[PDB]
């Protein structure tokens, strides 16, 4: 597992 | 042929291990994708032990392996021709390596979607949007793969394409594996991204063709690099296909506190995320431009 950082939207 | 592909894949991997490339570890990462593709091909071959002639005849698999050989040669040849410019981030040859990495990512995702568990399931592939499904079954039945021209003419009968130039923009949007065929998997991805079906190509015209915020083939780190130049302009944003969650959108934006964040809108169509995000003051300046499309 290799992921980029996706976070919660505004 | 399969073993020729492995040696080509092997050569790309060695080319991509060059420390001069300073190759970013984030998806899409060719050093992950190629050995993952190998492992999955290994899996397919193993389930087809004996019945190797069934496999070797499958139309999709034949197109897949042909594209795989062709993409790997094209990547080898890119290093050969680019020489020292491969090391200058921002050089065109380096940008092409990034686009290829994305194409390899889309190829593996498509392979896995068509051969999940290594058994061919293209003919029973379940299309996500019911409207879109019905168009595919009517025009192509249980086919897994159809030529671009043939996809284009069938789509045009239901959703008219404005012009040859738009047809070409459309092709480069839908043909993720860049091989002049449209798979039932690529079709599912496009029709998920640009739903609802009833207005499919007007959606795609508004979100991609005339929208300065859309970034055709851009990775997560490229979005981050591009918004960096707008770090002093909060509300700047761009958006693109997510690589690791194919079928969903990723929006990158600059916050007032000087962060660059990326988010995958859920339970809300892109249209609404973009409009809400405008109104709330987050998504203001598409690719840093002062003027924002009106998507209402």
Numbering used by the authors:
A (entry chain A): 50 to 59
B (entry chain B): 55 to 350
Paper quotes:
The protein product of the Casitas B-lineage lymphoma (c-Cbl) gene is a multi-domain, multi-functional scaffolding protein with E3-ubiquitin ligase activity that is crucial for regulating cell signaling pathways. c-Cbl regulates cell proliferation, differentiation and morphology in response to growth factors, hormones and cytokines, binding to substrates via its tyrosine-kinase binding motif (TKB) in its N-terminus. The c-Cbl TKB domain consists of three tightly-connected domains: a divergent SH2 domain that binds to the phosphorylated tyrosine; a four-helix bundle (4H) which packs against the SH2 domain and completes the phosphotyrosine binding pocket; and a calcium-binding EF-hand, which wedges between the SH2 and 4H domains. Consistent with other studies, our previous study demonstrated that the pSpry2 and pEGFR peptides interact with c-Cbl TKB through (1) a positively-charged pocket into which the phosphorylated tyrosine inserts and establishes the majority of the hydrogen bonds, and (2) a hydrophobic cluster, which forms significant interactions with the conserved C-terminal proline residue of the bound peptide. We also determined the crystal structure of the doubly phosphorylated EGFR and Spry2 peptides complexed with c-Cbl TKB at 2.2 and 2.1 Å resolutions, respectively, and observed that the phosphate group of the Ser/Thr residue shifts away from the c-Cbl phosphotyrosine binding pocket with minor conformational changes of the peptides in the interacting region.
